[PDB]
């Protein structure tokens, strides 16, 4: 890999610089290089990995949605034929998005997840695995769509089981996991009632644990609780 000659610490330092410069493709490449050094990642390093790829795939998803919408309208009754260009370019973006998801999933499988023993790291990585299978599911149309969905579900489910056993209901990773699994139910699995129930139970169990927290931890937890509430308001 092109980062093989750079020190781990220098890759981490440059990932932080790239974040400040809003150079998220660079940030992801630096963090990929850091992961490939083979050592476990610290809490801060895991955050850098997730932020980097969130922003890269986020640009691709937003572009894919724009193009998909244009493509669907071109398939409307009365739309003038414009040739293969819209489909071709949507396919190009889609292929690049799938490639980014495959890269992230490959880092998790080789070998972040298997080396992650603490609940905080293992849940973090399993949530990521669910997230990137979910992004694959958003664009999937063929004979593996069901298997992609089930892969997202299984990763999220293993993460939920660990987080319920090992983390308090206000833990921000536990909360963001439940939030995203709820989005999976609503947007991917066609299970809006499951989505609503999970978001409500997660919110209520967190509210009841807030009294145990410091002011700073309270701020961290209530921020993600507000996102659960925002979804519930949209969905009900």
């Amino acid at each position: 890999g092109a980062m093989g000659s750079m020190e781990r610490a220098s890759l981490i330092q440059k990932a932080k610089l790239a974040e400040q410069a809003e150079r998220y493709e660079d940030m992801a490449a630096f963090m990929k290089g850091a992961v490939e050094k083979g050592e476990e990642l610290s809490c801060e390093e895991r955050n850098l990995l997730s932020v980097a790829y969130k922003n890269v795939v986020g640009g691709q998803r937003a572009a894919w949605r724009v193009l998909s919408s244009i493509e669907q309208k071109s398939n409307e009754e009365g739309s003038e034929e414009k040739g293969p260009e819209v489909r071709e370019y949507r396919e190009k973006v889609e292929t690049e998005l799938q490639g980014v998801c495959d890269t992230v999933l490959g880092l998790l499988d080789s070998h972040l997840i298997k080396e992650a023993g603490d609940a905080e790291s293992r849940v973090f990585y399993l949530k990521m695995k669910g997230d990137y299978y979910r992004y694959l599911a958003e664009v999937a149309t063929g004979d593996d769509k069901k298997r992609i969905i089930d892969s997202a579900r299984s990763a999220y489910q293993e993460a939920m089981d660990i987080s319920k056993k090992e983390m308090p209901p206000t833990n921000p990773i536990r909360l963001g996991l439940a939030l995203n699994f709820s989005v999976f139910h609503y947007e991917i699995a066609n299970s809006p009632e499951e989505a609503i129930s999970l978001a409500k139970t997660t919110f209520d169990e967190a509210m009841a644990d807030l009294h145990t927290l410091s002011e700073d931890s309270y701020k961290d937890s209530t921020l993600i609780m507000q996102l659960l509430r925002d979804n519930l308001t949209l969905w009900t």
């Binding site: 974040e19 955050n47 850098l48 997730s50 932020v51 969130k54 986020g58 997230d131 921000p172 990773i173 963001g176 939030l179 995203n180 989005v183 609503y186 700073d216 961290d220 993600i224 996102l227 925002d230 979804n231 949209l234």
Partner: peptide, 9 residues
Amino acid sequence: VFXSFXXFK
């Protein structure tokens, strides 16, 4: 839109 969340303090 985006109703999800991914970098914790």
